Amino acid sequence: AEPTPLDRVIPAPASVEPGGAPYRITRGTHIRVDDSREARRVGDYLADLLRPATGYRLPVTSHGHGGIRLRLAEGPYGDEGYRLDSGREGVTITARKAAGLFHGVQTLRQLLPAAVEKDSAQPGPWLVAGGTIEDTPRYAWRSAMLDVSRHFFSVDEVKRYIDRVALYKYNKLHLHISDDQGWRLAIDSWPRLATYGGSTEVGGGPGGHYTKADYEEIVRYAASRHLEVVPEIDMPGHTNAALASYAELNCDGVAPPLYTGTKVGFSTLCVDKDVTYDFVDDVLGELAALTPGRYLHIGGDEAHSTPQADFVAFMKRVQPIVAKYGKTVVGWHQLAGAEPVEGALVQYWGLDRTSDAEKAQVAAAARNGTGLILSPADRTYLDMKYTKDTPLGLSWAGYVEVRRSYDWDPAAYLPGAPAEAVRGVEAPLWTETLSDPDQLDFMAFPRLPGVAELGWSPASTHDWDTYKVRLAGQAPHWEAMGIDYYRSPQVPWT
């Protein structure tokens, strides 16, 4: 075997300087970490990845021989970057914080042969190409969304999806935990939302919800994968589950039935009833107590049954509730037309046919200093069909093949918005049509690593013809990990 080339990694690393003979992990290699819990956690994570396929003991130690060295040190790598040095003497990953060590490990696993992901002992050799990678991200907002409201996904399925996104240096997990078809978090001040509002899902299945303990475990697990959880309570539209659970929240005071279909636009909270804000205050307060992350997403899309002036007055009242609990507002880009507060981010989900006036409104807010998360429906929506023949997913945004999802520049995308306003990107996975985790993987892969690269990699590394060869190189690893994926004909799979 020869080593996988040092640059064959997604995201493309910011700097790659290949040179010298490779490191070879052998029966005597140790994983040497600084003397601390933060250090041992990353070392034990790495050992868990490497022990099954190598069959080596790979002790995590703070003394002795090393071979794979994980070290924290001051340096120019910021909060999330790292340097990886590899040669005959060993592999050393250096960073300022545990998050850059963890990022360096996600790089190290792609450098290693695909057999590394197997769950039993495999022949070597275990080669890491020689040279130096120095790597820091282009954008700080690099996120993946999972809709657990349309179809429910369990704590264990969400942890499996966290492990998918952690491969590619995503650092935010947006969980869409409420919509018309379900409410997915126990709220003590409004107990019916989860108990009744969570009792079904699209298609009339058993639905589900996270207890407070379940939600804490999802947050703790994602943190151990350096993902900051960004929960969304969508409002004032996409609220049927909440309205069905509490008659008083409805303008007419009558609870609609639980909804199991896939239409949108029809539900609204009652903007002129004060009890609506008792409900928002209580839910956001309880969600904030469970959210160590900095952001609360209040949604704001498809409020088609809410008059514009009511939508504006609603967001005027609700956004300060987020600041009252010490968090920052994120909304879908409809919020740009309703006075985003200072610090608020908007998430653009539009597409090429979105009207010019609507695009100009979002760009106006960006010029006004509103930060922008880009997730265009005809680029990074992972539920969008690849072609007319994809058996799952939607096509309201057109067909989105692998090249189209990758081949754009978040810095030069929305006309009239400054580059400086772009906080980063997100890849959302909506679940109207997806009800099991193998289906999630088929729709998420192979576009998911592409959005991760847009978030992470320098613009100077961006290039379809050479990226598609790095993407083809992931397939053997996916196959060893058991990850289903769409074998696009645009990619030169080996």
Ligand SMILES: CC(=O)N[C@H]1CN2CC[C@H](O)[C@@H]2[C@@H](O)[C@@H]1O
């Ligand atoms: C933010 C967002 O994409 N909202 C809705 C946007 N709509 C547009 C058409 C679909 O119903 C789609 C739906 O799946 C999504 O939930």
